[PDB]
Amino acid sequence: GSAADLELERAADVKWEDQAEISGSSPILSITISEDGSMSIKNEEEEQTLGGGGSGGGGEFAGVLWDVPSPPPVGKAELEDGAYRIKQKGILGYSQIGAGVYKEGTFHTMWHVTRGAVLMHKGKRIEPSWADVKKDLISYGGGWKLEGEWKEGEEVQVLALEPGKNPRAVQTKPGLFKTNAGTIGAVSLDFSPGTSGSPIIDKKGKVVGLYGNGVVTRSGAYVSAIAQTEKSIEDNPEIE
């Protein structure tokens, strides 16, 4: 199956990009809720395209694509530092999810990108430290720790890496969609399917969370849950 070739490629940094475009604030949508736990639109989308799409340093066009500087003189772990385009040879072949979020020493991205697979540099393997389906958040290096948390009340921007192009910082204010439970409040955006792992970053580089699990709705708009850093619940002693 998979979990045998999942390569990283830095494209940008996890930060507000000056390409700030107001496109969110999308009012009331109707999304088809699957048994309350899941939520989606009943329209089969298909849009596996981000990494490559031009001779942009990172690439190969054979296996995967990279931008990883782990050096033989003093290195051990992997750290390209920032917002990554990411692509595996697995599941349905050679396809890119896009956004891999590594800040300081912690790599923290979405769960729905996988079912808890291992990472690498096209034939050099590195294991993640955490995977959680509930919040839809995975970690590498250790337990995730930032600070900020976005929720439907304040306005933010989503840092979505474009296919073959620059990190599209889209200004996304709170949105919501109608539900069997009444309404869910989330990030409602009229735009192309934003990259999986897109960090929720303010103009001042605040919050720096993650776009949650969602779908291309109206076969045109992209609406997804809000994911944020609650700080990793280390109830257990880290050593003793």
Partner: peptide, 4 residues
């Protein structure tokens, strides 16, 4: 790393 696959779809989105």
């Amino acid at each position: 790393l696959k779809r989105x």
